[PDB]
Design an enzyme around this catalytic site. Structure first.
Site, mmCIF file in Angstrom:
data_model
loop_
_atom_site.group_PDB
_atom_site.id
_atom_site.type_symbol
_atom_site.label_atom_id
_atom_site.label_comp_id
_atom_site.label_asym_id
_atom_site.label_seq_id
_atom_site.Cartn_x
_atom_site.Cartn_y
_atom_site.Cartn_z
ATOM 1 N N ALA E 12 -6.311 -1.840 -8.301
ATOM 2 C CA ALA E 12 -6.459 -0.672 -7.440
ATOM 3 C C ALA E 12 -7.355 0.379 -8.080
ATOM 4 C CB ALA E 12 -5.087 -0.081 -7.118
ATOM 5 N N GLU E 246 -6.287 24.978 -13.977
ATOM 6 C CA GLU E 246 -5.738 25.998 -13.082
ATOM 7 C C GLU E 246 -4.598 25.454 -12.227
ATOM 8 O OE1 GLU E 246 -7.008 29.059 -13.304
ATOM 9 O OE2 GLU E 246 -9.029 28.807 -14.122
HETATM 10 N N1 LIG Z 1 -5.288 2.327 -1.745
HETATM 11 C C1 LIG Z 1 -5.552 1.157 -2.315
HETATM 12 N N2 LIG Z 1 -4.544 0.446 -2.933
HETATM 13 C C2 LIG Z 1 -4.810 -0.749 -3.513
HETATM 14 C C3 LIG Z 1 -6.094 -1.266 -3.491
HETATM 15 N N3 LIG Z 1 -6.076 -2.452 -4.132
HETATM 16 C C4 LIG Z 1 -4.817 -2.694 -4.562
HETATM 17 N N4 LIG Z 1 -4.018 -1.652 -4.175
HETATM 18 C C5 LIG Z 1 -2.579 -1.502 -4.449
HETATM 19 O O1 LIG Z 1 -2.202 -2.337 -5.525
HETATM 20 C C6 LIG Z 1 -0.935 -2.911 -5.292
HETATM 21 C C7 LIG Z 1 -0.842 -4.295 -5.929
HETATM 22 O O2 LIG Z 1 -1.091 -4.238 -7.318
HETATM 23 P P1 LIG Z 1 -2.575 -4.479 -7.889
HETATM 24 O O3 LIG Z 1 -3.249 -3.169 -8.208
HETATM 25 O O4 LIG Z 1 -3.374 -5.240 -6.862
HETATM 26 O O5 LIG Z 1 -2.399 -5.399 -9.197
HETATM 27 P P2 LIG Z 1 -2.286 -4.803 -10.688
HETATM 28 O O6 LIG Z 1 -1.948 -3.334 -10.697
HETATM 29 O O7 LIG Z 1 -3.573 -5.058 -11.431
HETATM 30 O O8 LIG Z 1 -1.095 -5.655 -11.353
HETATM 31 P P3 LIG Z 1 -1.112 -7.264 -11.294
HETATM 32 O O9 LIG Z 1 -0.749 -7.725 -9.905
HETATM 33 O O10 LIG Z 1 -0.114 -7.813 -12.282
HETATM 34 O O11 LIG Z 1 -2.497 -7.751 -11.640
HETATM 35 C C8 LIG Z 1 -0.776 -2.962 -3.783
HETATM 36 O O12 LIG Z 1 0.534 -2.599 -3.416
HETATM 37 C C9 LIG Z 1 -1.762 -1.946 -3.247
HETATM 38 O O13 LIG Z 1 -1.073 -0.848 -2.702
HETATM 39 C C10 LIG Z 1 -7.111 -0.555 -2.870
HETATM 40 O O14 LIG Z 1 -8.253 -1.007 -2.847
HETATM 41 N N5 LIG Z 1 -6.836 0.658 -2.283
#
Ligand SMILES: Nc1nc2c(ncn2[C@@H]2O[C@H](COP(=O)(O)OP(=O)(O)OP(=O)(O)O)[C@@H](O)[C@H]2O)c(=O)[nH]1
Ligand SMILES: Nc1nc2c(ncn2[C@@H]2O[C@H](COP(=O)(O)OP(=O)(O)O)[C@@H](O)[C@H]2O)c(=O)[nH]1
Ligand SMILES: Nc1nc2c(ncn2[C@@H]2O[C@H](COP(=O)(O)OP(=O)(O)O)[C@@H](O)[C@H]2O)c(=O)[nH]1
Ligand SMILES: [Mg+2]
Lengths: 426, 116, 41, 48, 431, 426
Positions: E12, E246
């Site tokens: 993310a 701030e």
């Molecule tokens: N807003 C937003 N949320 C995202 C996006 N991509 C992934 N997420 C969030 O990430 C969550 C899933 O975890 P990930 O970030 O994909 O995976 P990680 O944090 O690298 O952890 P691992 O799965 O172990 O690799 C989901 O519930 C999404 O809400 C994005 O492009 N935009």
């Protein structure tokens, strides 16, 4: 010949200082390059009050610029009149206060006061007869109010027998810029009452009222707000720079104006402020100046003098001006307003006249007023201070810098004692 | 080993002015004045004499690595201003629980300020 | 003249980029001469 | 620029080949300048 | 010289940073090669004397399949090669894997690189950390990141932007387990933490931007506009500046209260932007509207306890004060009694910029609000409910116990924020 | 009539002497060839102070250059002004020192002084009435401070009734170019206490800080650092070569400072150093020039005078101006800082004027000051010398060269008594 050293502190203090040095340079005919381009001779008779000589007939302001964040520094330097300031007078740190009086007074501002006191001493000891100091700051922030009071407390110990003016932007009644503003303002007024000779209260809501109703503008930017207060500052010290028929400098006013050492909180106002459409329907005459001067609309603070009593009144007139009408009009308002003036001081009004008017204006005047009605400004921020202090809120950002909790209790106890002695002199 | 102030250009040689944002090694503000010559306390190879007191710390250092730090690291900003007398006691006990991290060469040094 | 109501100019600007004419080098606060104004002008 | 403190600039802004000649040395155990015909720094002649 | 270091941890965080750094290059006029075709870029880019600009950000992750798109995509030359840190095996939606086993071999290299960017900086305002609660790397490795950053840097500002787990829809099963145990680390080692969730941005894009099916590409653009609106006071000249320090001070009144809500207004399509005027009053009531919240929680149940307003474009301070005086007289909007002056404003001159392929329109003025409420207490009663409902029979706990953590941490993490739930009502009750 | 024989020693001495001979050749109008190409007759009035006479109107400097390695002499000859020096004046050696004070003083240094004294005596016997000697060296090395104190010892016996000035580069508190620099400094100061008329202490911190805080140069080269020293050491002796209203020989500047033979360590400073882009703002008058002399930031030694008491002060001026405008400023600084000037003697500022200013400048001055802040430099060396001598660190590079350990106990016991004697006069 009696020099005044200018002090600016904070973001608001530098945005109000940039316009102040623009209106003085326009008054004395100083171009933004630095030279002199004028038509009269009286402009150069008394110019050393604010300006220092240089090589080739160049004039530099006698001002220092203090800010913990150099963000406002670059905007001042890149402005139309940014090349006139001395490049060594800019004093700046690396990290800002972040709207915290504790950081600006004890932690972040403690290692910059020594670097700026060198420059203050350099500008002050180069004067043959220093009249005093002048400070522009706002209580709204952390570096204007934090180390601004720190610089005050070191200057008073070094130069005790001097004069010092403060033009403080006290917080607004309706909409405030900072959430922690009652903490920053109560702890700064307590530092101001024992260490300031004259203090002026400037309200942004009062400035909004001028540009909306009296001046009838639709886009009142901060440049237009800062032009109103810069006209007041130049008009207070106009008898020092320009000759007149009845002269009065800062020490001359404050003797007539301060009856007791805890009574130094004034309220300013500019007389000739007319709208565009109303200009064709109005003649500038001495009764017109003294009628708009005493109007509660025109005054530059958020306190109505109808709710209080005028303790002492000061008026400084400008231009080639008569004397019988000047004495007659400020006598008639005293006789008509029997209740708004105190009775144990006769003739509360003090008069000063200057000969040289501002450019493009025939006549002008400035108002300085001491009233009991300014205590409603203190009561409004004291009840907000006690409202936040009972629940012990927002002050883990304060006691985490070493400050104890007894400082707030003594700051409010001084402040409740300050409002209680305004009442029994009413 | 020991830094010494220039006593007028010390502001030019501080940590954050030289762009180092981590906490700092201390600076010797005052200098003690000796008198006479100094007695010699070590061998030719560098061994200390049998009669001189010896510190009991590690002779190599007090650096603490990744796999040696405590699992629950106490915070560096601790204010006990608006907390209860049990919660603030729990935080200062959590601070006190690991003496190894406080005296290390890295050394997270909390500043407990205020009262509950 | 120079009055509050009268003093106004048209703002024919698009970019409001802020220059950095005050900075730090080594351990010293340097005051660079402004070679450019607001917004690359 | 009449040789005031601070009114001078380097002569090595983009120069390369910062060699140096061995002007001074020993010959028959007495101190002499061994050769007058040695270049300055990078091969340039020494002012005539 | 007012520089900020961006940390993009997790899938993310990387995918947010792709849209965020695409926005920054167009804002300052930087081609994807890293060169020019003012020094406002100096807060994000470092001037190499050959004419190249390098961002002061790191992209850290535990899997190679998300960053290898960056190394081959159209921004393959802008980023430094060594600022894209890549692991071998992911945490696999686990906290103990990303905390005790896999998070520890890369914490050497991440803090090595952060030290080098900190040496390059001449004035540091803070670190911006982007992660998601429901992930594995965002759950586990970010907890070590804040804990180690407090050791290395004492009081430096740690602004955090989080993808909060949505109430009804989510993409994981052990997601509540990951999200309980990150609060306990981030209560004491984080300075401020804005939250958004994917479900609320789905409702905004469906109703306002007349688009039926968004993807992660056009939600990351909305998040990038919020981060740009916060930082724009540092970059561009404004009539009233706001620093990162701030609203850190202005939104956190108590040590356990560092959870503000971020909302943006206006956000409209180009067809409706022709037809609606956008005044200062009309954009300051949209952010107060509960339908335009970017967090799925109604603040009418709670009460506003601090606020912050950030304005961009052609905005007049007089109309700002008239708008705030109007919103203070509404009886639907409720404040606490101990905060009479509950506002903080900031004004910048430069209007927001538009990117090609974006869904937003070219609007002269916009606002970004950071509001701290009491209405998060219902958002943690629900999240403690679904954590409890699967912890009662001790499900999925053999996955966490077997990686290096004992069973006692689950009782600690539940007890700590249960006391915090009693803390939110204690602050919320008026005198 | 009165001639000054110049001596150099070490790598630092050779690169600071080549710059000094370049500056005063431009001051007296001497081309790099060696002839005369000037503008006025008064540059030939006193030119025999630093130059000799040759056939065909050639002027050669009266200087000697010593070193242990010809690497610095190769760079000096290849430089811009390296062809003016006499080829017989270069006295070099075959083996280096290594920042080993024991090597330069005992082992190799015994075989080179008998060749150096053969050359300086030829330059000294030609003068009809020699004035004094000069020595520019550094205390952080094995050649300038190791062998250079043998020349201190031997010349003093041969010419007792002469004035000997040393421009010594004291070690730096934070640079630390040598690990064994407190070992070389402690032994060199112990020689300079009883065997030197005047000592000028120059520190590299103050040379870097002056060139950044005041001159505002981004990239200072060691050639620019040598220029600040060369301008100072040519302005000290300016009255011997140009006629003025109130002259001052080097003996004049020795009588009116040192009250006791053990207190001759000074703190130099040069007044008109102005910023690169701020000569438009500055005004060039002697009250502005005086406050730049006495500013603690303009000192050329890393020791704050505010921590101690000013014992005596010399102020040699340069340029055509008035006398009461100089004497009033010397009176003013004394009567405002009663806590920094020592009480048991009044009148502790000696002033002098010379008529001809430096080229391209109107006014100039050079500050020399006896202060009690010199004990701060010595006690900082003593605590580093003690901390390294307790643990027998680096002693095999000294005991193996033929000196007893009692000499190490002698030098600190002489210097600790010197620190204690400075303290009781504060
Ligand atoms: N807003 C937003 N949320 C995202 C996006 N991509 C992934 N997420 C969030 O990430 C969550 C899933 O975890 P990930 O970030 O994909 O995976 P990680 O944090 O690298 O952890 P691992 O799965 O172990 O690799 C989901 O519930 C999404 O809400 C994005 O492009 N935009
Ligand atoms: N009249 C006027 N007020 C200003 C100006 N700029 C800022 N202010 C006021 O200053 C207050 C904030 O001050 P702040 O910038 O935080 O002070 P600082 O942090 O100490 O520099 C706000 O309430 C503004 O209304 C100006 O140009 N004119
Ligand atoms: N001010 C100044 N100091 C110098 C110069 N060259 C060398 N030094 C100082 O001299 C010290 C090293 O001296 P060194 O070469 O060992 O002296 P030597 O052994 O006697 O030749 C260093 O600490 C430098 O700071 C110079 O041109 N100017
Ligand atoms: Mg992951």
């Amino acid at each position: 010949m009696r020099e005044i050293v200018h002090l600016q502190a904070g973001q608001c203090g530098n945005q109000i200082g940039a316009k102040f040095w623009e209106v003085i340079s326009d008054e004395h005919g100083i171009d933004p390059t630095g030279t002199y381009h004028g038509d009269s001779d009286l402009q150069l008779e008394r110019i050393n009050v604010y300006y220092n000589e240089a090589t080739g007939g160049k004039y530099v302001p006698r001002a220092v610029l203090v800010d913990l964040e150099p963000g406002t520094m670059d905007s001042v330097r890149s402005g139309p009149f940014g090349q006139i300031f001395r490049p060594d007078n800019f004093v700046f740190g690396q990290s800002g206060a972040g709207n915290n009086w504790a950081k600006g007074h004890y932690t972040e501002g403690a290692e910059l006061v020594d670097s700026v006191l060198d420059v203050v001493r350099k500008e002050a000891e180069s004067c043959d007869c220093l009249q005093g100091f002048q400070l522009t700051h706002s209580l709204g922030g952390g570096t204007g109010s934090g180390m601004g009071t720190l610089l005050i407390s070191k200057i008073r110990e070094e130069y005790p027998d001097r004069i010092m003016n403060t033009f403080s932007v006290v917080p607004s009644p309706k909409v405030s810029d900072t959430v922690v503003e009652p903490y920053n303002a109560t702890l700064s007024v307590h530092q101001l009452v024992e260490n300031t000779d004259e203090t002026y209260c400037i309200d942004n809501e009062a400035l909004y009222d001028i540009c909306f109703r009296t001046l009838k503008l639709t886009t009142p930017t901060y440049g237009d707000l800062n032009h109103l207060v810069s006209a007041t500052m130049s008009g207070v010290t106009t008898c020092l720079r320009f000759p007149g028929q009845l002269n009065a400098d800062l020490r001359k006013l404050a003797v007539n104006m301060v009856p007791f050492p805890r009574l130094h909180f004034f309220m300013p106002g500019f007389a000739p402020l007319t709208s565009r459409g109303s200009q064709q329907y109005r003649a500038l005459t001495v009764p017109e100046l003294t009628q708009q001067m005493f109007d509660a609309k025109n005054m530059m603070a958020a306190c109505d003098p109808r709710h209080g009593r005028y303790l002492t009144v000061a008026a400084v007139f400008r231009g080639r001006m008569s004397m019988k009408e000047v004495d007659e009009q400020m006598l008639n308002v005293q006789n008509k307003n029997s209740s708004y003036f105190v009775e144990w001081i006769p003739n509360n009004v003090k008069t000063a006249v200057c000969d040289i008017p501002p450019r493009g204006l025939k006549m002008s005047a400035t108002f300085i007023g001491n009233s009991t009605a300014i205590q409603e400004l203190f009561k409004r921020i004291s009840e907000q201070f006690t409202a936040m202090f009972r629940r012990k809120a927002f002050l883990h950002w304060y006691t985490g810098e070493g400050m104890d909790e007894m400082e707030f209790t003594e700051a409010e106890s001084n402040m409740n004692d300050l409002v209680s002695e305004y009442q029994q002199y009413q | 080993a020991t830094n010494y102030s220039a006593n007028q250009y010390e502001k030019a040689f501080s940590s954050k002015y030289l762009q180092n944002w981590s906490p700092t090694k201390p600076t010797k503000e005052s200098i003690s004045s000796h008198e006479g010559y100094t007695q010699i306390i070590a061998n030719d190879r560098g061994h200390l004499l049998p009669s001189v007191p010896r510190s009991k710390a590690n002779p190599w250092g007090s650096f603490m690595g990744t796999w040696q730090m405590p699992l629950k690291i106490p915070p560096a900003r601790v204010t006990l201003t608006s907390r209860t007398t049990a919660g603030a006691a729990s935080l200062t006990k959590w601070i006190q629980k690991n003496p190894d991290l406080l005296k290390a060469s890295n050394g997270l040094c909390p500043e407990i300020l205020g009262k509950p | 003249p120079f009055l509050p109501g009268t003093s106004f100019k048209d703002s024919t600007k698009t970019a409001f980029h802020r220059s950095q004419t005050l900075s730090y080098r080594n351990g010293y606060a340097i005051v660079r001469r402004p070679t450019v104004g607001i917004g690359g002008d | 620029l009449p040789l005031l403190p601070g009114n001078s600039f380097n002569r090595n802004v983009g120069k390369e080949k910062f060699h140096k000649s061995q002007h001074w040395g020993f010959c028959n155990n007495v101190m002499m300048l061994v050769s007058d015909e040695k270049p300055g720094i990078g091969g340039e002649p020494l002012l005539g | 010289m007012r520089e900020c270091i961006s940390i993009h941890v997790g899938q993310a965080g990387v995918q947010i940073g792709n849209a965020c750094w695409e926005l920054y290059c167009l804002e300052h006029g930087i081609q994807p090669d890293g060169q020019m075709p003012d020094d406002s870029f100096n807060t994000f880019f470092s001037e190499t004397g050959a004419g190249k600009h390098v961002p002061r950000a790191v992209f850290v992750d535990l899997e190679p399949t998300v960053i290898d798109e960056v190394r081959t995509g159209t921004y393959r030359q802008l980023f430094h090669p060594e600022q894209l840190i890549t692991g071998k095996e992911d945490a696999a939606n686990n906290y103990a894997r990303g905390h005790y086993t896999i998070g520890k071999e890369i914490i050497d290299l991440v803090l090595d690189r952060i030290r080098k960017l900190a040496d390059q900086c001449t004035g540091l305002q803070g670190f911006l950390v982007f992660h998601s609660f429901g992930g594995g790397t965002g759950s586990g490795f970010t907890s070590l990141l804040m804990e180690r950053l407090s050791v290395d840097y004492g009081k430096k500002s740690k602004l955090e932007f989080s993808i909060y787990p949505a109430p009804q829809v989510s993409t994981a099963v052990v997601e509540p387990y990951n999200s309980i145990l990150t609060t306990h680390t981030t209560l004491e080692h984080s300075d401020c933490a804005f939250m958004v969730d994917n479900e609320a941005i789905y409702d905004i894009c469906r109703r306002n931007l007349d688009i039926e099916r968004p993807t992660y590409t056009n939600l990351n653009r909305l998040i990038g506009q919020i981060v740009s609106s916060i930082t724009a006071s540092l970059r561009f000249d404004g009539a009233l500046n706001v620093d990162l320090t701030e609203f850190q001070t202005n939104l956190v009144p108590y040590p356990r209260i560092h959870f503000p809500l971020a909302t943006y207004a206006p956000v409209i399509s180009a067809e409706k932007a022709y037809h609606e005027q956008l005044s200062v009053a009309e954009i300051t009531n949209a952010c107060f509207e509960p339908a335009n919240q970017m967090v799925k929680c109604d603040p009418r149940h709670g009460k506003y306890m601090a606020c912050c307003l950030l304005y961009r474009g052609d905005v007049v301070p007089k109309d700002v004060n008239a708008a705030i005086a109007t919103i203070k007289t509404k009886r639907t909007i409720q404040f606490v009694d101990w905060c009479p002056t509950g506002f903080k404003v900031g004004i910048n001159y430069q209007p927001p910029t538009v990117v090609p392929g974006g869904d937003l329109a070219k609007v002269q003025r916009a606002v970004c609000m950071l509001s701290n409420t009491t209405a998060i207490a219902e958002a943690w009663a629900r999240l403690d409910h679904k954590f409890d409902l699967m912890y009662a029979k001790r499900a999925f706990v053999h996955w966490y116990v077997g990686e290096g953590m004992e069973e006692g941490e689950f009782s600690e993490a539940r007890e700590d924020m249960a006391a915090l739930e009693k803390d939110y009502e204690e602050v919320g009750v008026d005198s």
